[PDB]
């Protein structure tokens, strides 16, 4: 019902599937055993001529997060101003008042590094969407699910033996053949030995 | 008290801490398990004594 | 090719078999995990002995 | 400290040959529920099934399609399936805890787990909440 | 080995016709792949059947 | 001492004659994906309409004679399990409550 790789051309030394696709065997084992997705195809031209609008929407979402966290910091500043005004108006301990002020400061620092983590997540998914190349592994699958629903129409990514079948399907042999000919022509050291 | 072998391994001990030694023993003996400071010290008494 | 094999040979060429040749050698799709009848000891329909 | 953190991170990112370890790591993500959430999800399931049955009797020349009514009944019909999948992904751990003792004879442990999963799909098909009971006591029988 | 391949293939066909979340279908396809691997060469990938 | 085995199959001994046999026809069956297969049936024998092909899928006969197409029913649905345990008034109650909830969540 679903395709299946041969065990003979995958789990030998050298792995012939890994040599034909130039992929490491400990990543091929993660692909064909449903442990990590792979990029079966990519569309460089649509990302190429729409990347300005896409990074504009990225900047829109990132600035919305910036405005939301500025409102969060202003809300914590208003709450700490109310804490100071209700702390220094009655008879209270200045050590406990400093602890209240430091609690408000830890609240707004939690706000700011949570916002920093959200911005780092958005810039990380943007960095990966820029560096989206075929034969790339996307481990832990949540970044992949966050990267499918945004821009599903610009790339495809599968997992397993059907992905390996599609990778072999959209594969020219003469291109990598002449490329390896050029590399063994103009190489030296370990690189030429692996290309041989 | 009388061998350069044990003195050189003493200067090459490289891991300070008895509880750190229990954690290192647990992390070396058992693979793929998050270490804990409670069950590691009970493991060694369950293994050899 | 030769499927009768009357004692004249020149070459024994190995090669990697494809899905078309695999479903072209076959005489039918086996589709049940049954081997034999437990009572009458006859092969089941669409089983591994059909 | 972070030494135990990097130790647990290095030990947790280890690859072995057991597929069942990967399966348990897979199912250990979604947390368990409570009875009110089970009631809400079953409400969503039955509402989505009634909405797609309304779409079934609507797919003939039963009525013209208003835009907002069409799109939000599509939203309810799609929400019911997500609730169904949520309930299944919740009680996968109960399936494993039931299948863990029928080993030792004949079948493989993953095969036992998979047939328990199929029984759990049947149990969430024929589960009812208006008897006011917990889901696990009903699903243990079918598993 | 042939019975295990036939059983897991039939169960995968039933699961696809039924419609299931991704965890079940991925586990079933992994079990199918390992069954075919054990049929062609037992004991190659990890512990033998 | 010695242990013997026997496959459950009788073994005859005759002469493989090639000349005088019972004569036989040939019919062509057609599958869904354009596959054709030829099955030698005996002469004094009924030609069945459908026939399970070598391909594994069921293949009809190449000459149109219109046998019984389906003569079956769908087994069971989750909608059938829902409908056999509750009433359509209860279903409409849950539907109207869910419609008011999506209304108050969307624009209300």
Automatic annotation (TrEMBL), chain B:
It comes from the Bacteria. The RNAP catalytic core consists of 2 alpha, 1 beta, 1 beta' and 1 omega subunit. When a sigma factor is associated with the core the holoenzyme is formed, which can initiate transcription. DNA-dependent RNA polymerase catalyzes the transcription of DNA into RNA using the four ribonucleoside triphosphates as substrates. Belongs to the RNA polymerase beta chain family. This is DNA-directed RNA polymerase subunit beta. It comes from Mycobacterium tuberculosis. The chain holds residues 247 to 295 of 1172 of the full protein.
């Amino acid at each position: 019902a679903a395709p299946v790789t041969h065990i003979w051309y995958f789990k030998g030394v050298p792995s012939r599937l890994g040599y034909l696709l130039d992929l490491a065997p400990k990543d091929l084992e993660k692909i064909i055993y449903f442990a990590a997705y792979v990029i079966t195809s990519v569309d460089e031209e649509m990302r190429h001529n729409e990347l300005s609008t896409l990074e504009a929407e990225m900047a829109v979402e990132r600035k919305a997060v910036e405005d939301q966290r500025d409102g969060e910091l202003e809300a914590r500043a208003q709450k700490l101003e109310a804490d100071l005004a209700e702390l220094e108006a009655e008879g209270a301990k200045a050590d406990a008042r400093r602890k209240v002020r430091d609690g408000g400061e830890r609240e707004m620092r939690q706000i700011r590094d949570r916002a920093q983590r959200e911005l780092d997540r958005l810039e990380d998914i943007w960095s990966t969407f820029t560096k989206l190349a075929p034969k790339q592994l996307i481990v832990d699958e949540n970044l992949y699910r966050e990267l499918v629903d945004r821009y599903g129409e610009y790339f495809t990514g599968a997992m397993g033996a059907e992905s390996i079948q599609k990778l072999i399907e959209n594969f020219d042999i003469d291109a990598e053949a002449e490329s390896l000919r050029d590399v063994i022509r103009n190489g030296k050291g370990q690189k030429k030995l692996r290309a041989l | 008290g009388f061998s350069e072998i044990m003195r050189s391994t003493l200067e090459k001990d490289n891991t300070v801490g008895t509880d750190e030694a229990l954690l290192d023993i647990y992390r070396k003996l058992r693979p793929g398990e998050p270490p804990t400071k409670e069950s590691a010290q009970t493991l060694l008494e369950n293994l050899f004594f | 090719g030769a499927m009768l094999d009357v004692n004249f040979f020149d070459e024994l060429r190995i090669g990697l078999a494809t899905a078309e040749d695999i479903r072209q050698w076959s005489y039918g799709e086996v589709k049940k995990p049954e081997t034999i009848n437990y009572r009458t000891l006859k092969p089941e329909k669409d089983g591994l002995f059909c | 400290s972070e030494a135990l953190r990097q130790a647990r991170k290095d030990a947790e990112l280890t690859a072995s040959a057991d597929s069942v370890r990967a399966y348990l790591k897979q199912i250990g993500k979604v947390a368990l529920l409570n009875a009110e959430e089970e009631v809400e999800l079953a409400k969503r399931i039955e509402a989505g099934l009634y909405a797609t049955q309304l779409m079934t009797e609507l797919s003939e020349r039963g009525e013209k399609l208003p835009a907002a009514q069409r799109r939000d009944m599509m939203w309810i019909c799609r929400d019911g399936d997500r609730a169904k999948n949520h309930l299944l992904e919740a009680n996968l751990r109960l399936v494993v805890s039931l299948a863990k003792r029928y080993t030792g004879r004949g079948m493989a442990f993953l095969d036992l787990i998979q047939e328990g999963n199929l029984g759990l799909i049947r149990a969430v098909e024929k589960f009812d909440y208006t008897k006011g009971y917990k889901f696990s006591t009903y699903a243990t029988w079918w598993i | 080995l042939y019975r295990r391949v036939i059983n897991r293939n039939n169960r995968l066909k039933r699961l696809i016709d039924l419609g299931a979340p991704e965890i079940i279908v991925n586990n079933e396809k992994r079990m199918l792949q390992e069954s075919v691997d054990a049929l062609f060469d037992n004991g190659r990938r990890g512990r033998p059947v | 001492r010695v242990l013997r085995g026997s496959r459950l199959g009788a073994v005859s001994y005759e002469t493989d004659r090639n000349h005088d046999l019972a004569p036989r026809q040939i019919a062509r069956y057609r599958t869904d994906n354009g596959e054709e297969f030829e099955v030698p049936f005996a002469d004094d024998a009924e030609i069945p309409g459908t026939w399970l092909c070598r391909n594994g899928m069921e293949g009809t006969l190449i000459e149109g004679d219109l046998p019984e197409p389906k003569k079956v029913k769908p087994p069971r649905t989750h909608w059938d399990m829902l409908l056999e345990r509750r009433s359509i008034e209860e279903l409409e109650e849950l539907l109207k409550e869910r419609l008011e909830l999506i209304r108050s969540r969307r624009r209300g």
